[PDB]
Symmetry: C6
Subunit: 208 residues, 6 copies
């Protein structure tokens, strides 16, 4: 990663072993749950393209999803070439992904004046691929999330928005109407009686 000293200069540092282990443990314990993407973005703060490849390469299984991620990176690299086809040489799509660029060249673009943040650009592509993976690996559709007859309303809302976050790539009024439609008859009657425009706080209080 590229960080700055206690004095105040941008320097390259080796990826910490604690960061490497934290990322491996997240994939092993959470698979591709939606919260894996914000964890990846945080653990790769200031990462070079080389660091991002290191993090992706330490992932054990899930190689079908990883190949899909590599294909997404290939698409974004080709689109970058179409949008960008004494003067400094500017990076190609393969330079941002780190397949045709050295660490020295990556540091050059990132600490140039003005800078080309090849690390941030690459991270954008990776997060795009990770979003496509989370959506596909979502077990259930949001339309199949229905409150059981003996399931508390709070536990039902937990499954609802957990599913919604995986399908929307963590990114409305149709959601609220679906949450009410798929509540059990007793709770739905109460929710209907609350009048439109009720907050989630008022809905969960009314169905306690």
């Amino acid at each position: 990663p590229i960080v700055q000293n206690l004095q105040g200069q941008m320097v390259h540092q080796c990826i910490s072993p604690r960061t490497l282990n934290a990322w491996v443990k997240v994939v092993e314990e959470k698979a591709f749950s939606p919260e894996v993407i914000p964890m990846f973005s945080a653990l790769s703060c200031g990462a070079t393209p080389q660091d991002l490849n290191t993090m992706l390469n330490t992932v054990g299984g899930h190689q079908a999803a990883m190949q899909m991620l590599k294909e997404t990176i290939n698409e974004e690299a080709a689109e970058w070439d179409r949008l960008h086809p004494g003067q400094m040489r500017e990076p190609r799509g393969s330079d941002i992904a780190g397949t045709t660029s050295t660490l020295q060249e990556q540091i050059g673009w990132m600490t140039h004046n003005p800078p080309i943040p090849v690390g941030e650009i690459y991270k954008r592509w990776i997060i795009l691929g990770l979003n496509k993976i989370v959506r596909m690996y979502s077990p259930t559709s949001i339309l199949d999330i229905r409150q059981g007859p003996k399931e508390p309303f709070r536990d039902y809302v937990d499954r609802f928005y957990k599913t919604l976050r995986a399908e929307q790539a963590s990114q409305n009024a149709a959601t609220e109407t679906l949450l009410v439609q798929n509540a059990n008859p007793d709770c739905k009657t109460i929710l209907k009686a609350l009048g439109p425009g009720a907050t989630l706080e008022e809905m969960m209080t009314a169905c306690q």
Copy 2:
């Protein structure tokens, strides 16, 4: 977060994996017990709005509470815009404090300006308000229904009493504490008279 370097300047620093891991474990273990809010306020010391969004986004379960927290954040941002209508520095909107329409460099520019506009501390106040609602929501019992069992030691009844009172939130609470004790200890408490401290009440009912 924004920390201090060895030149007196406030510099930006990546959020550490130990801080991220600590906050995730706190939610997994304590759920929304009252002590989760001082833990969040301390782990987010010096956090930017981006760092605050990172911490909330790494919470996997309890998405009903996190959605409730997002609605609280939206309500506080709209109220901020109402109280702040449109070489002068541009001031942040509610969506800038929440980090939805502001870049990291803009957030750093506000927090390190002279004088500073602490968008990180303002956002943290909106989050803590939402967490207060969640903790009160997850409180399994109202304070009025906390009653000492006929065989329950007085110390264990007081533990439940003040844990509940803290989750919901004084002469009214002392009245309720003595009123809801079992008949045995209740007569020993009323026999003490007014001005009895909790230490005195727990000693008189230790048997």
Copy 3:
């Protein structure tokens, strides 16, 4: 907390997640054994009143004891005001961190001469923890007697473990030994060291 820099400067730092977790685990594992108090004193080294409230607020259970601690703080704060009647000097609530900002707390601790509001508050907290440790001690020192088949060292272990939670004592130790060892202790004479008393009744 306010700590020495690497460049010889007293600066304010965020409280460590390591330190917070250590204080939480101590209360969970040890409840209110006597050794909780020296652990709290070391973990709050250099702490502001804000940091001290943060530590106390992370305690999840034992809210009966924490309420007792809260009432002890209020009695110490009210006594501070009576002993300091009206450079603005801090009131009792300023030391307790209820009416003072972090910037005012730093303004007192790093003044020349300093008003150590963090050290004063920690003293009030430790006085409150002393009362909790005493109240949560199961047995009085007078009820500690040596069993007929209990080795002397095991009886001394329980005697001073109880005495630490409570707080002469030498008289009680010999008086409450079993009739056998009690004879050998008085046979050695007065002013015998504990080592000499434990080797005689081994």
Copy 4:
């Protein structure tokens, strides 16, 4: 490892107990799965030849693979002695031979010097390259199955089959050919649907077309 102090100078540092325990646990828990190589290169970031020998020596199991690694290291050392075959000028350093890069006949002070020289000589990065070439061979040999024998079971979800496919492919390569193999060894049910999608299908499309 050779890091940099605040005075912009490259200083030598002791290997952390964290990095040591990490590399040991990596080999103990993951054996020689393909992800161990990038974990070694990252844990050996900025390492001297001595640091690399220390990490390899803390591995106590799999001594058969470690001996193979030694044999690969000796081959690459003899190669270097050929493509890079005496009074040393003041301020300069001796030319490194293959045994010097591997740390057998070199000293830490010489290693620090080469890696800090104003004309830099990265003996550690050259040694790491030789080690990774050897680890590539170990990963290939420890692959229990060949790519040509990866076949989708009758009730095996396509997702699990592609997982085993590309895990094997990554261990052997330590491309239409792989795709044609992927569609061929899919169970007859999925194979038909995949042939129907036509050519030039993305893995994302083939997987949602075989859920």
Copy 5:
């Protein structure tokens, strides 16, 4: 403790949670085995008298031993007052008041006074002096906790010679003695050993009775 900063000055530092938990854990797991004394000495590196009292006060249980240690500290503090009597009168400018035994033990001295002695030029190491008093008391605790003396250990006729030497030097650490190990062996190994006779290294002894 007292550590050196980036300006070559000895400054005070808060005792770390890792240091506290480590000392508590070694007492919980090892009681007062002889190895707890070098562990105490290493974990108390740079400690002030205040730090040493914190470490002793966090010890749970074993309060009879802690009481003996407390009495040993009082004896050494009284001996210090006898050998270093404090002189009355005003204290020279830029100088520290002379520490008595209670100052070294940390009962009557402030933290600022302890730092003043430990960082003075020349320094009065009240932390090192106090730690010697503590280690002396811990040695007396290790002895009273030792179950068996170095004489009441003998090699079982079926016990291997290595296992016997393990119990030998273990009980010796708790309590020219290498001339008794041969004597208190089993009749078999003894014979073989005496055949080697003099100048016998322990390595030679264990080799002679390997089977």
Copy 6:
């Protein structure tokens, strides 16, 4: 230990609780396996003689082995005294007295003296000299705790060849003090099981270990 300050100054640091606990655990879990020795050397990087004595003194059990290590240290110290006798007289200003064997072992030298030696210009590395003496004694311990001879490592009738080679070079490493021959690989072929030994002989002489293990993968 003695490390480089961020300001480029060789200064003394206390040994860390992380390092102290790591060494104790290694001996508790791995005993005296060959990989313990490089772990000791890595955890004692930059250590003074006082630190090295601390690490050895915190070891629980194995006191027969630790006594043998102690005697090995005495032999190396006596050899140091015979090769570097201390010249009598006063020590020149700004100089350190000449260390004897007991000073390198940290028995008759203070921490301040050890620091003066290790940071002198040029330095006398009393920590590195002592660590060599410790690794020598640790080599004898590794061989003692590993009694199985390499001549007695034979592949089981149904044992996979890879597991047999694992045991072979693990045993060889313990006997050789991790010091790196045809006779090694020929013994490996000689003591394989009939099925594998045939294939190995069918490969021809002078095969590499990679070729041998690939041939017996079945």
